[PDB]
Short mmCIF file of C-alpha atoms in Angstrom, two decimals:
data_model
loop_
_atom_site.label_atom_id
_atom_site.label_comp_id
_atom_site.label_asym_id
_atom_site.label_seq_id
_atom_site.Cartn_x
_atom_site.Cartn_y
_atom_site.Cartn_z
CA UNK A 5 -28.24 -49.96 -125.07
CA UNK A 6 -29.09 -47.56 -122.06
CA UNK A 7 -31.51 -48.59 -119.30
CA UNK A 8 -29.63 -51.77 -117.99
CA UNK A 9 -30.84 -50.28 -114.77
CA UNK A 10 -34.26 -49.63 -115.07
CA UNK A 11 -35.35 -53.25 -114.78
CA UNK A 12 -33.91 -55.60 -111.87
CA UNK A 13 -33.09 -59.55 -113.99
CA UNK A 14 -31.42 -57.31 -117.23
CA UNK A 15 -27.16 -58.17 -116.71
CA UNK A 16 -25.41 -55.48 -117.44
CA UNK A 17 -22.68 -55.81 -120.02
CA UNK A 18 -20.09 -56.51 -117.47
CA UNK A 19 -22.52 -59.35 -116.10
CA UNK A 20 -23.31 -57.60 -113.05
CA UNK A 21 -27.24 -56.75 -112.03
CA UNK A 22 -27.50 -53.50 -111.16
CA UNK A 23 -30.53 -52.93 -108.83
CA UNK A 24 -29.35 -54.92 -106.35
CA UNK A 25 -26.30 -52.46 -106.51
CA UNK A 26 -28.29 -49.75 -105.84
CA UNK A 27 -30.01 -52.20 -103.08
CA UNK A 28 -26.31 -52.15 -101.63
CA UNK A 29 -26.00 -48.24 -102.25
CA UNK A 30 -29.56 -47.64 -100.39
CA UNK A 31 -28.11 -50.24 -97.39
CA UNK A 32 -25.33 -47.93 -95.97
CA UNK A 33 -27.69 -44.91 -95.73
CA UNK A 34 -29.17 -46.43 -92.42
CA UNK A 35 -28.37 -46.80 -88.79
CA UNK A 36 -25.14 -48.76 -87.77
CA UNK A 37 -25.46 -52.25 -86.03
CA UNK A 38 -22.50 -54.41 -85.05
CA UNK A 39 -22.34 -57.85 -83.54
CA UNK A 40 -19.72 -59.80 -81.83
CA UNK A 41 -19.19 -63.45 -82.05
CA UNK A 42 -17.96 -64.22 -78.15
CA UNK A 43 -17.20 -67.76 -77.19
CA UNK A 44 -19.96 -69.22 -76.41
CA UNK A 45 -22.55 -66.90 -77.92
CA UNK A 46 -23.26 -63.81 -79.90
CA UNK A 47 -23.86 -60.41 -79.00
CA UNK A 48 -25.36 -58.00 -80.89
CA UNK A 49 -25.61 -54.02 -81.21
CA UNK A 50 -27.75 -51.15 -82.85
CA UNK A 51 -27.14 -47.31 -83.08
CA UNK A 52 -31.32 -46.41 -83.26
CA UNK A 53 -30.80 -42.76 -83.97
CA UNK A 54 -32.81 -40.14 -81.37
CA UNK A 55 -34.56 -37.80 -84.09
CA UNK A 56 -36.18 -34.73 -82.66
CA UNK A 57 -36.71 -35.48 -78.50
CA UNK A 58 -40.99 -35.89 -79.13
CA UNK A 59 -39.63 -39.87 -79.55
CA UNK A 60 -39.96 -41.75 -76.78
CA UNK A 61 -36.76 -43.08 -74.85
CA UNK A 62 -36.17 -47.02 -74.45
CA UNK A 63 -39.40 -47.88 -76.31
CA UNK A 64 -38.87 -47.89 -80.01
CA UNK A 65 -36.64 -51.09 -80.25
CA UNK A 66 -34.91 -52.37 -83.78
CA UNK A 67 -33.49 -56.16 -82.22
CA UNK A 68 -36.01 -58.40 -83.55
CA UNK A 69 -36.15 -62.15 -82.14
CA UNK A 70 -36.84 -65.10 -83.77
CA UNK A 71 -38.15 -68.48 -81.58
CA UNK A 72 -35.50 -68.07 -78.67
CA UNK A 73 -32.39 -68.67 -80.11
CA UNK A 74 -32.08 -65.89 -82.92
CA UNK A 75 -31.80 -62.82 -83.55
CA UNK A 76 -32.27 -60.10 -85.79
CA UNK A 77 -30.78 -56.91 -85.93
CA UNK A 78 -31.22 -54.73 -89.24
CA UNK A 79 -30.11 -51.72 -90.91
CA UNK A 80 -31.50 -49.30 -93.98
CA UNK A 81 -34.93 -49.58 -95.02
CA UNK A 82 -36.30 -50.98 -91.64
CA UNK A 83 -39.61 -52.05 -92.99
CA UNK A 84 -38.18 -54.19 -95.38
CA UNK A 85 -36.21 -56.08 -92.79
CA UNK A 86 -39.00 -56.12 -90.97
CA UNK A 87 -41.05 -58.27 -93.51
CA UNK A 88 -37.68 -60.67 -94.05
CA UNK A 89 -38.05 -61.27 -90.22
CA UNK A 90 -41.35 -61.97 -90.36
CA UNK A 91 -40.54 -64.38 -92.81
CA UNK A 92 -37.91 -65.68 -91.38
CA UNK A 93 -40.10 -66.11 -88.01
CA UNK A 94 -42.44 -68.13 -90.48
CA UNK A 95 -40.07 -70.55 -91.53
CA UNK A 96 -38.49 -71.38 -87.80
CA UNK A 97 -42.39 -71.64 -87.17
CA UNK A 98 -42.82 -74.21 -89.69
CA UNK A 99 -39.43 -75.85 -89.26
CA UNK A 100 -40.14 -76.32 -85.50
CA UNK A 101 -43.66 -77.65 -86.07
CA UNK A 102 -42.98 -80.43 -88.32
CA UNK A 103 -39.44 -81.11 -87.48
CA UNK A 104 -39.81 -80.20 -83.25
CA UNK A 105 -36.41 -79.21 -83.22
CA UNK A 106 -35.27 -75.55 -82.80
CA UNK A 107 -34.17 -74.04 -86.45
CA UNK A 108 -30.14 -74.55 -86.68
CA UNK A 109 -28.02 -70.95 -87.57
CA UNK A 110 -27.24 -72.31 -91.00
CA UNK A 111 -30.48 -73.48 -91.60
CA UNK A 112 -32.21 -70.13 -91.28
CA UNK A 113 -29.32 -68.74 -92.69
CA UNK A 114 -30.15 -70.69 -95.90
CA UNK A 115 -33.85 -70.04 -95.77
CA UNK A 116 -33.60 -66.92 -95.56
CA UNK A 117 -30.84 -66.37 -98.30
CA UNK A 118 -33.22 -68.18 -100.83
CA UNK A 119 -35.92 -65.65 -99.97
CA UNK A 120 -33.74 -62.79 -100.46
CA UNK A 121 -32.78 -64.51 -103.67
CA UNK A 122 -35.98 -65.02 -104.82
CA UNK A 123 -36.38 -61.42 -104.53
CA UNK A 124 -33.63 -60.74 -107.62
CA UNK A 125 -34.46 -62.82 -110.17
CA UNK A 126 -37.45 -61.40 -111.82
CA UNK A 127 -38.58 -58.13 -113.16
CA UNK A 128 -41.98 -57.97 -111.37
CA UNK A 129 -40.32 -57.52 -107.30
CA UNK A 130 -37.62 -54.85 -105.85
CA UNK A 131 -34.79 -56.67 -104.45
CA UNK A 132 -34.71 -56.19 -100.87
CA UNK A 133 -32.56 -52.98 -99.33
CA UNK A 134 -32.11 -53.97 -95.77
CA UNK A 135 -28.99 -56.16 -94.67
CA UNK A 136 -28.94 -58.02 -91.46
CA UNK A 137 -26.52 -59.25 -89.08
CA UNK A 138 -28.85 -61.87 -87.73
CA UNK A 139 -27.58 -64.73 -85.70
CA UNK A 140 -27.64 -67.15 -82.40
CA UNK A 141 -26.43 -69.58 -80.52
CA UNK A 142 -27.24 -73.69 -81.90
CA UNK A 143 -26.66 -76.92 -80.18
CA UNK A 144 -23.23 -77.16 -82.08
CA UNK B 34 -64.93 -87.99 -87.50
CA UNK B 35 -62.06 -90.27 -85.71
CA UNK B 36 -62.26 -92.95 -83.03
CA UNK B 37 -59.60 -92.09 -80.30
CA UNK B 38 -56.95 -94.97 -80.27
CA UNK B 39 -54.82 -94.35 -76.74
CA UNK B 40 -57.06 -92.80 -74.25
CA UNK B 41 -56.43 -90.33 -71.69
CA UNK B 42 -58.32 -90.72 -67.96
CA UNK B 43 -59.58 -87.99 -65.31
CA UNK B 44 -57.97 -84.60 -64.67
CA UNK B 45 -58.97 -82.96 -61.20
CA UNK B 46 -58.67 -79.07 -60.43
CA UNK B 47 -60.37 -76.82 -57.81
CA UNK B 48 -59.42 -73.65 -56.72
CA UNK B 49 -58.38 -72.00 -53.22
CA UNK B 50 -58.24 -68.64 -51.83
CA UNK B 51 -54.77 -68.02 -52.68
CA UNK B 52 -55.15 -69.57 -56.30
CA UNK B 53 -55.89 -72.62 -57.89
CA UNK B 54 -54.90 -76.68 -57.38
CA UNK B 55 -54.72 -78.97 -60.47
CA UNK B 56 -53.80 -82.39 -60.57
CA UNK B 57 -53.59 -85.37 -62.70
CA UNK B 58 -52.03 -89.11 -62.90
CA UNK B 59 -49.13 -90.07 -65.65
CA UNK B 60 -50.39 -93.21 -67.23
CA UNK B 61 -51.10 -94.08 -70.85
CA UNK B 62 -54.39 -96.56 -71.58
CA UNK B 63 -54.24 -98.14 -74.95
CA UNK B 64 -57.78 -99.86 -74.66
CA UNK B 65 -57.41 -101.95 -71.44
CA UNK B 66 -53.72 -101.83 -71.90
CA UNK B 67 -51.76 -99.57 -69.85
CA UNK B 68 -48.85 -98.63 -72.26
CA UNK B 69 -47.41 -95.74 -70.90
CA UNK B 70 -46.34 -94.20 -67.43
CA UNK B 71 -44.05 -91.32 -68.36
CA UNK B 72 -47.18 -89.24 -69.75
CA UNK B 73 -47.08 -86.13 -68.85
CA UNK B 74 -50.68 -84.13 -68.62
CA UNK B 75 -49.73 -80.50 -66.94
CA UNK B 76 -48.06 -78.18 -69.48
CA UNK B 77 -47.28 -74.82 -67.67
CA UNK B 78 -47.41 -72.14 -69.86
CA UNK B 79 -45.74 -69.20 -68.22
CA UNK B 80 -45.31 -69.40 -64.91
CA UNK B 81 -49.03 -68.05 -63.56
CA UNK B 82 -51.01 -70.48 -65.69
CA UNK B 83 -50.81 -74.32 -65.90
CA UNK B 84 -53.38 -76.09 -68.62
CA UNK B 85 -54.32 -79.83 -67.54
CA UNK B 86 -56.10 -81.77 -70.82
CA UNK B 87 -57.33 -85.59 -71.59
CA UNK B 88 -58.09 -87.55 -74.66
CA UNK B 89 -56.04 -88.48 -77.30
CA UNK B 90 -52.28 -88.77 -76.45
CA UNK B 91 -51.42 -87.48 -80.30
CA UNK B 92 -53.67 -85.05 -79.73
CA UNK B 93 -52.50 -83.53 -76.18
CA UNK B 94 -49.12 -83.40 -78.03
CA UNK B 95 -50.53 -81.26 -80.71
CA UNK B 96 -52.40 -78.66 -78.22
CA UNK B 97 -48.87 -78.72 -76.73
CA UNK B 98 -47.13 -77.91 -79.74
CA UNK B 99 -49.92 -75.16 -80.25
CA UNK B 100 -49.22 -73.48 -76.82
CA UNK B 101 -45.38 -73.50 -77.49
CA UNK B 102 -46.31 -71.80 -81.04
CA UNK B 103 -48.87 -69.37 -79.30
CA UNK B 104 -45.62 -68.75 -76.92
CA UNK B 105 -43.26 -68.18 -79.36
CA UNK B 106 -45.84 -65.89 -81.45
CA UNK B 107 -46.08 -63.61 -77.78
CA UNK B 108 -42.63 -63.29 -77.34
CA UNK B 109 -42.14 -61.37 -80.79
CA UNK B 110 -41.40 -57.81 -80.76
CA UNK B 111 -43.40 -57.59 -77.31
CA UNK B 112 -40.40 -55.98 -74.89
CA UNK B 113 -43.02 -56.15 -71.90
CA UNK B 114 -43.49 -60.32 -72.51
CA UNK B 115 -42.06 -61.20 -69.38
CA UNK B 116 -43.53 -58.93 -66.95
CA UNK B 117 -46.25 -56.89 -68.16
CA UNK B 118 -48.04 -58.43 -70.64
CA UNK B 119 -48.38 -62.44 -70.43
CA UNK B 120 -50.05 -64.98 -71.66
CA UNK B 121 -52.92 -64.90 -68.79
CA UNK B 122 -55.10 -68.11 -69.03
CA UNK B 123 -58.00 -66.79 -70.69
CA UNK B 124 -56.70 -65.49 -73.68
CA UNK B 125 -55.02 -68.90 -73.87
CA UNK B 126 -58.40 -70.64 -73.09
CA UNK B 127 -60.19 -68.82 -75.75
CA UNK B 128 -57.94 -69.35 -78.08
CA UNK B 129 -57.86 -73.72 -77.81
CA UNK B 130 -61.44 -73.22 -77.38
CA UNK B 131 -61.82 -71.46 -80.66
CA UNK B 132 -59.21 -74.33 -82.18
CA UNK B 133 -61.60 -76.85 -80.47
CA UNK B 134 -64.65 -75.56 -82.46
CA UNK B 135 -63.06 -75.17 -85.63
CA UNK B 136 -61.78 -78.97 -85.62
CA UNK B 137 -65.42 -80.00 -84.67
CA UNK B 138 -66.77 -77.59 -87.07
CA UNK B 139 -64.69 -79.30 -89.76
CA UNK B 140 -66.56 -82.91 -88.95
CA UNK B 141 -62.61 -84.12 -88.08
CA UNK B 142 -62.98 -83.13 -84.06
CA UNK B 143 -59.90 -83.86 -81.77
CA UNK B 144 -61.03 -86.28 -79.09
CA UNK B 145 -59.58 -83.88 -75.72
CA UNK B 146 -60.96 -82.22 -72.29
CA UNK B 147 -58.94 -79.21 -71.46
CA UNK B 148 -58.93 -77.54 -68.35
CA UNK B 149 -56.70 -74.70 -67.91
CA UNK B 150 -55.85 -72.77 -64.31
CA UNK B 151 -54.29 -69.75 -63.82
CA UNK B 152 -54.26 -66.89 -61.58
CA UNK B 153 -55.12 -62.94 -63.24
CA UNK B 154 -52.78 -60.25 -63.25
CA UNK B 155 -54.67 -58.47 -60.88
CA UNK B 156 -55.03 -61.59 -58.62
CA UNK B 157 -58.39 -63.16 -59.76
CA UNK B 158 -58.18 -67.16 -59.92
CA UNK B 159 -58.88 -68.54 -63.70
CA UNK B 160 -60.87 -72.23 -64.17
CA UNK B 161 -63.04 -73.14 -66.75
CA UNK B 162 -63.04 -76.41 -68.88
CA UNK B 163 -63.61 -77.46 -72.66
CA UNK B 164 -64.38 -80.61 -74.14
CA UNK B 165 -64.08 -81.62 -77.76
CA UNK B 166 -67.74 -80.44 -78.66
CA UNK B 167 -66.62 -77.07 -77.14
CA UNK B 168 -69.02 -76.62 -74.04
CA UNK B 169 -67.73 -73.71 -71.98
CA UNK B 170 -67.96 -73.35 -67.94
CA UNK B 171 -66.35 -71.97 -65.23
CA UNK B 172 -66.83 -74.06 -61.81
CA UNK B 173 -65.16 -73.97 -58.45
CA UNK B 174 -64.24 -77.23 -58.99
CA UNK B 175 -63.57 -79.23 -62.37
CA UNK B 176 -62.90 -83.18 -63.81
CA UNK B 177 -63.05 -85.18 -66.99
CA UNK B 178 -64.70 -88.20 -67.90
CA UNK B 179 -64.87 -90.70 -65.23
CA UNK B 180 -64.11 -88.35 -62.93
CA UNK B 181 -66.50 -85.46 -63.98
CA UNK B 182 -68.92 -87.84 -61.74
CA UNK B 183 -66.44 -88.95 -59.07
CA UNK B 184 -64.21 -86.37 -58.23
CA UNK B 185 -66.64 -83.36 -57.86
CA UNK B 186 -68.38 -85.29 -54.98
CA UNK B 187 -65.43 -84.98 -53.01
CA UNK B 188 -63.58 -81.55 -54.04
CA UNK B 189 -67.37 -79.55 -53.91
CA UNK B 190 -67.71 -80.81 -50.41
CA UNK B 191 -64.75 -78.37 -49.25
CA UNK B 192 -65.41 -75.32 -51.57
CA UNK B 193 -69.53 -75.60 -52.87
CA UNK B 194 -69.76 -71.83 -53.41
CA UNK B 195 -68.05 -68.51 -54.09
CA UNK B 196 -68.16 -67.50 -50.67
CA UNK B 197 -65.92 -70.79 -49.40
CA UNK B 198 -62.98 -69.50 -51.93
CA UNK B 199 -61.43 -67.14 -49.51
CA UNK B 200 -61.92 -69.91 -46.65
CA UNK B 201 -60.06 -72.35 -48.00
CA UNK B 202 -56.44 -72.49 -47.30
CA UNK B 203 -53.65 -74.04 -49.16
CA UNK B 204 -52.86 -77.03 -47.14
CA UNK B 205 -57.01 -78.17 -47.04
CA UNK B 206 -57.07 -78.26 -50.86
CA UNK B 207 -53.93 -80.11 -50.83
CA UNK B 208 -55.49 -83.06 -48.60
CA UNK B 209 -58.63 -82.53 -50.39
CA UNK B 210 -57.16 -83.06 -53.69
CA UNK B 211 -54.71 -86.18 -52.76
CA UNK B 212 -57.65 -88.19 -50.87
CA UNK B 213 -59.80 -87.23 -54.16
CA UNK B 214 -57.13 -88.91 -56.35
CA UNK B 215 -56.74 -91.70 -53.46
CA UNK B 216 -60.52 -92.68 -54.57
CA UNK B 217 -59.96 -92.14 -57.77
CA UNK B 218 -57.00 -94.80 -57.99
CA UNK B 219 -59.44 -96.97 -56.02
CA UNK B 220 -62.00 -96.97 -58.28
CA UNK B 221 -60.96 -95.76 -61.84
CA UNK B 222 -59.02 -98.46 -63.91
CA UNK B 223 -57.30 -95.90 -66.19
CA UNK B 224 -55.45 -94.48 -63.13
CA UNK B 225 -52.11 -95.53 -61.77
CA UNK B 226 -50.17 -95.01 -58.67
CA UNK B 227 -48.47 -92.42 -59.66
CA UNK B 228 -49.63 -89.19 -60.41
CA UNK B 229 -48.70 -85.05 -60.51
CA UNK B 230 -49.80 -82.30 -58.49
CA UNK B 231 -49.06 -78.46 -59.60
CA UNK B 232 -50.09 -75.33 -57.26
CA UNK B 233 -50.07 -71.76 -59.12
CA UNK B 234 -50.17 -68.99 -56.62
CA UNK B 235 -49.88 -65.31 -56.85
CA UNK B 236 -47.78 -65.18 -54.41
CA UNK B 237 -45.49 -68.20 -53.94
CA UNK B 238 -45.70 -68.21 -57.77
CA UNK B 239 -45.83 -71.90 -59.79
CA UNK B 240 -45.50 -74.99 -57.85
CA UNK B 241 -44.90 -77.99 -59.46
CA UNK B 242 -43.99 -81.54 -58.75
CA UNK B 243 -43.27 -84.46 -59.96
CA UNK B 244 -42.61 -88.56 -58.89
CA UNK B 245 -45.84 -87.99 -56.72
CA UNK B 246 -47.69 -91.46 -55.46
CA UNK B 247 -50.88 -92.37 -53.53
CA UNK B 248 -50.27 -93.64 -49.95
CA UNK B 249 -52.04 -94.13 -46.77
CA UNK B 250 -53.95 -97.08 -48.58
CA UNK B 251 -56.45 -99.29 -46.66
CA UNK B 252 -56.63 -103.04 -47.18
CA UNK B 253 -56.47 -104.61 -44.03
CA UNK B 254 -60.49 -105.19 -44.05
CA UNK B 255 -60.48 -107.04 -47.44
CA UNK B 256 -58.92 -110.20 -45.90
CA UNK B 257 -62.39 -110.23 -43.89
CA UNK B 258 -64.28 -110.94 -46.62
CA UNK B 259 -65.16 -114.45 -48.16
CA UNK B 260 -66.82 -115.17 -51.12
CA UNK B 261 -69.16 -114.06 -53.06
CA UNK B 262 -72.13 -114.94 -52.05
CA UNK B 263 -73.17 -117.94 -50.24
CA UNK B 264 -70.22 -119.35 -50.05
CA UNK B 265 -67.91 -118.71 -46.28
CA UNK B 266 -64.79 -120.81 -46.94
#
């Protein structure tokens, strides 16, 4: 039957979801942003394109930080990123408050893969169209 | 409604011409037991404002926990954090002020006496105090508990009104302050030997130190004295 797309938990014959292809499709239709794992840290990169020149210079900025240690750099639908590093701030928040020790890489990688997740598995939420190349330096 | 379990003791802070002085002992007081000496009671937040607090020792960790959270929630997406925009003191002092009222609001108050110093962005000395029922007041010169009562005394003495801010110098608030918390170690039981002394200025910036004791002590006249009363041998 047709409309395998229309909804986002619906598999698709092959047993692959489909709006979180198009998720993937929207993604690459943004600004590139690289990042370089040096020895002892990271370092990371945008491309914030310079639309007509009423913008101003050095002032719109796209590397969001989370506590001290990580950061977030994001590409596609920027808002949407936006509102997974807000959450993501949320949880190092919390993590920090009842634990008082800064949020380990994997850690917030984890928390925030089960948000994004929880983003794809029911028919009633878009899945998320920003990917992010978010990362830090840890005591390991 | 609690009953504080590990009390704090007296925080002293008066301001100069070039900024403000703040100062306060590391000792723990568990009842009339004196548990701990590491305590720390100055948290600098930033480096133009230093908050000195008293009460519960659970509960100065929590406002410090709070200011690290209020730090963290500045530093987002704010690319002028460091220099232009900061976390000057009052913002910071409204905002445990407004904690402090909602906890006593709430019938479950925190048992604390904050006192916060800092220095303005456009070079205006900061100093006001709040206790757990949330009164509000800014004074040339500032204490807690025991102290509220013993230090003022001495600190008013060099600075009593607005006009003796810009005569005061640095090193006079310095001697003021250590032979205030000289008397203080004489005569307040929750006070130890030990103590620290911070000095913000917008110039020199934050100055703080640490391992800081309480000499030039007089006893040689107490061996004079015999008895305590009518007796003489």
């Amino acid at each position: 039957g047709t409309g395998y797309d229309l909804s986002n938990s619906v598999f698709s014959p092959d047993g692959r979801n489909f709006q979180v292809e198009y998720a993937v499709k929207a993604v690459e239709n943004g600004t590139t942003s690289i990042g370089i794992k040096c020895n002892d840290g990271v370092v990371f990169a945008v491309e914030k394109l310079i639309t007509s020149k009423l913008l101003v210079p050095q002032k719109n900025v796209k590397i969001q930080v989370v506590d001290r240690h990580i950061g977030c750099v994001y590409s596609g639908l920027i808002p949407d990123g936006r509102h997974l590093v807000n959450r993501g701030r949320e949880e190092a928040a919390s993590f920090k408050k009842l634990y008082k020790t800064p949020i380990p890489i994997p850690a917030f990688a984890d928390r925030l893969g089960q948000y994004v997740q929880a983003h794809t598995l029911y028919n009633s939420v878009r899945p998320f169209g920003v990917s992010t190349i978010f990362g830090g330096v840890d005591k390991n | 409604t609690q009953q504080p379990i590990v009390t704090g003791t007296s925080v002293i802070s008066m301001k100069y011409d070039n900024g403000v002085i703040i100062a306060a002992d590391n000792l723990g007081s568990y009842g009339s037991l004196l548990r701990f000496n590491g305590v720390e009671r100055l948290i600098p937040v930033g480096d133009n404002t230093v908050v000195g607090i008293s009460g519960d020792i659970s509960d100065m960790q929590h406002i410090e926990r709070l200011l690290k959270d209020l730090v963290t929630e500045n530093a987002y997406d704010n690319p002028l954090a460091d220099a232009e925009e900061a976390l000057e003191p009052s913002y910071i002092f409204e905002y445990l002020a407004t904690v402090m009222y909602q906890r006593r609001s709430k019938m479950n108050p925190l048992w604390n006496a904050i006192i916060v110093a800092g220095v303005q962005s456009n070079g205006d000395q900061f100093l006001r105090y709040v206790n757990l029922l949330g009164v509000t007041y800014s004074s040339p010169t500032l204490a807690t508990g025991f102290g509220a009562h013993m230090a003022n005394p001495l600190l008013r003495k060099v600075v009593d009104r607005e006009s003796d801010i810009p005569k005061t110098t640095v090193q006079v608030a310095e001697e003021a302050i250590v032979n205030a918390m000289r008397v203080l170690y004489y005569r307040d039981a929750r006070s130890s030997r030990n103590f620290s002394l911070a000095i913000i200025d917008k110039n020199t910036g934050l100055t703080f130190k640490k391992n800081l004791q309480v000499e030039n002590m007089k006893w040689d006249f107490a061996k004079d004295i015999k008895g305590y009363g009518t007796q003489k041998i």
